[PDB]
Amino acid sequence: YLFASDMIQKFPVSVHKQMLRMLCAKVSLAARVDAGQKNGDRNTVLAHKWKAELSKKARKLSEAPSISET
RNA sequence: AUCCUUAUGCACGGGAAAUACGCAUAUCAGUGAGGAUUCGUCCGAGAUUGUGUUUUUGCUGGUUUAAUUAUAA
Structure with a gap:
């Protein structure tokens, strides 16, 4: 269900395999925040940093590399 | 006091390789690199980029004739 998300297929094909492994982790941690957030007040701002890092x-x-001197 | 386990240092002895060993005011990376699967999951530290040397590093070995001096006159 993740490979069809927005943060993966908005990028070129060659990057997909590395983004799954990179996004999956950041999903898990997000869930591990959601278990700890109290029901009365649920809050973001970890997922903002975590989109910044991923994008x-x-x-x-x-x-792609810079050019090399002959 | 003896005996044993793990890790590390020095070392005698015995092998194998040098398409192999390294370097970086550089990018990421247990806050998850890179893979595997029997599709339930499972393993868990390097990957990129530039570069140096790589039929080779250092050191060695082999091969290409002294002086003195003796006759009976």
Whole structure:
């Protein structure tokens, strides 16, 4: 169900295999926050950082090397 | 006091390899790299990028003739 999410297939094909392993973990931790949040008050701001890391690190995985001097 | 287990250092002795060993004011990475599956799950530390040398590193071995001096005159 994750491989069909937005944060994976919005990126080029070659990056998919690494994003699953990268996204799955960040999903689990999110759930591990949700178990600890009290029912009365549920709060974000961990998932904001955790989208930042994933999107940026994905741009970086897609960025390709710089050119090399002959 | 003896005996034993693990890890590390030094070392005698015995092998195997040098397409092998390293380096980085560099990018990520147990806050999950990289894989595996019998589809339930299972394993758990490197991967990228640049670069140095790599029929080779250091050191060695082999091969290409002294002086003195003696006759009977």
